[PDB]
A paper describes a structure:
Following the conventional nomenclature for SH2 domains, the Grb7-SH2 domain possesses a 3 stranded anti-parallel β-sheet consisting of the βB, βC and βD strands, flanked by 2 α-helices, αA and αB.
The immediate striking feature of the G7-B1 interaction with the Grb7-SH2 domain is that, instead of the staple acting as a stabilising tether, it acts to form a new Grb7-SH2 domain interaction surface. G7-B1 is further stabilised by hydrogen bonds and a salt bridge between E3(OE1 and OE2) and Arg 462(NH1 and NH2) with these interactions not previously seen in Grb7-SH2/peptide structures. Instead the staple forms close contacts with Met 495, Asp 496, Asp 497 mainchain and sidechain atoms in the EF loop of Grb7-SH2 and Ile 518 sidechain in the BG loop. The staple contributes 83 Å2 of the total interaction surface area of 548 Å2.
Numbering used by the authors:
A (entry chain L): 1 to 10
B (entry chain A): 426 to 528
């Protein structure tokens, strides 16, 4: 949900 | 918040990775720091399977009441302590529990 962070990746 | 052992204040992403690297890349090793890209917010930096992940924590205000969230308000916390304490027992959106504080 945030470019450059791992939140709810992928 | 500032009193907490897992809180490192203003440090960079690279620095968090160096610190977590010092203490052996243990699964669930973590710290919280201020975000460099988003100075109003924080980052939960967490080692999982020897890779360091970074979870953005942003403030929001609902009816004049501040909360913090890592998932656009799906899961909300009054402060960083509540967030950390929840994720020591529940994985939530994280790949693992918060097991060990990076001092």
């Amino acid at each position: 949900s945030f470019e450059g962070y791992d939140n709810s990746f992928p | 918040h500032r009193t907490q052992l897992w809180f490192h204040g203003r440090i960079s992403r690279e620095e968090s990775q160096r610190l977590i690297g010092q203490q052996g890349l243990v699964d669930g090793l973590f710290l919280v720091r201020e975000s460099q890209r988003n100075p109003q917010g924080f980052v939960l930096s967490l080692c999982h399977l020897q890779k360091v992940k970074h979870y953005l924590i942003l403030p929001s205000e609902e009816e004049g009441r501040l909360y913090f969230s890592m998932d656009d308000g799906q899961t909300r916390f009054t402060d960083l302590l509540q967030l950390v304490e929840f994720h020591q027992l529940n994985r939530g959106i994280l790949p693992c529990l918060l097991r060990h504080c990076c001092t």
